[PDB]
Structure formats: structure tokens, C-alpha cells
């Protein structure tokens with residue numbers, strides 16, 4: 001009944017084919033592509049919050065060497081579990097289902113300096129994950145959804161010149 005589908009999945013797959021990269025900065029940088037999902041099967045009458053976090057994908061970091069990503073060493077200690085609350089939260093099921101849910105404003109940083117940003121470790125791979133939480137639920141039920149097409153490596157600068165070009169092209 002509940003269905004959460006990735007929007008613009010073909011576009012994410014073009015980046016994933018190259019190995020996607022997302023820039024992190026001291027002040028925080030918005031993602032491109034933007035993560036957007038369509039939702040059906042919630043109770044239109046109920047209220048829900050939408051949350052976003054980033055799950056580390058490997059037990060090692062990465063390095064771009066001779067035009068290829070390769071295992072690049074031991075990981076750094078895990079980033080703190082930062083969660084991003086979608087600014088429309090809390091809202092009716094009808095609100096979330098009437099048009100795609102877009103996380104256009106989240107910013108990724110390599111420095112914990114508030115502002116509701118997500119701290120990531122450079123040269124580590126992450127996968128976005130969305131959680132739906134129902135308001136007023138004594139069971140505190142939450143549903144979690146992963147998006148394999150949206151995996152990316154966090155970078156202080158683009159390594160792959162094809163990614164640099166792709167980002168300029170489709171944006």
C-alpha cells in the first residue's frame with residue numbers, strides 16, 4: 001500500500017554510472033541532483049513528518065586514481081548521525097502525496113557548524129535514506145526507505161572531470 005518512488009531516476013543513474021560525487025564545504029552545499037520522491041498509500045487524513053539521513057556504505061574510504069575510484073584506505077570514525085527534517089513537516093498525508101517531496105534545501109558539510117546541515121566525511125561513500133514518521137502515534141512507527149540510485153562519494157572537490165562536466169550540463 002505505501003509506495004515511495006524515486007523521481008528522475010534516469011538522471012541519478014547517469015551520475016551513478018560515473019560514480020556520483022557531492023561537494024562538502026565548511027558552510028554547506030546543496031545537492032545536485034536534488035533528492036525527490038513521490039509518495040502514495042499514506043492516510044491522507046493523518047499527519048506525518050519526513051526525515052532524511054545518510055548511511056555510510058563501506059568499511060573503507062575511496063580514492064580516485066588513474067581515472068578510477070579504488071579503495072583508498074581505512075575509514076575515518078563514523079560521522080555523527082545527523083538527521084534533516086523536511087521543512088514541510090509535520091503535514092497531512094494529502095500534502096505529501098499531492099506532489100513530489102523535494103529535499104532541495106539540505107546542505108552537506110565537512111564541519112559541524114549547525115544550521116541543520118549534514119556532516120559527512122570526505123572520500124567516503126553514502127546513500128540517502130528517507131524516514132516517514134506519523135504524528136501522534138503511541139507506537140512511534142517509522143518507515144525507512146533507501147535509494148540505491150542516489151549513492152555518492154563526498155568530496156571537497158570533484159575528482160572525475162566527467163562529473164564536473166555532467167553537473168554543469170544537467171544543471
Ligand SMILES: CN(CCCN)C(=O)c1cccc(N[C@H]2CCN(c3ccccc3F)C2=O)c1
Nearest residue numbers: 001002041042043044046132133134141142143
Ligand atoms: C485508520 N488507518 C488504518 C488502516 C485503514 N485502512 C490508518 O490510519 C490508515 C489508513 C489508510 C492508509 C494508512 N497508511 C499507513 C501506511 C503506513 N503508514 C505509516 C507510514 C510511515 C510512518 C508511520 C505510518 F503509520 C500509514 O499511516 C493508514
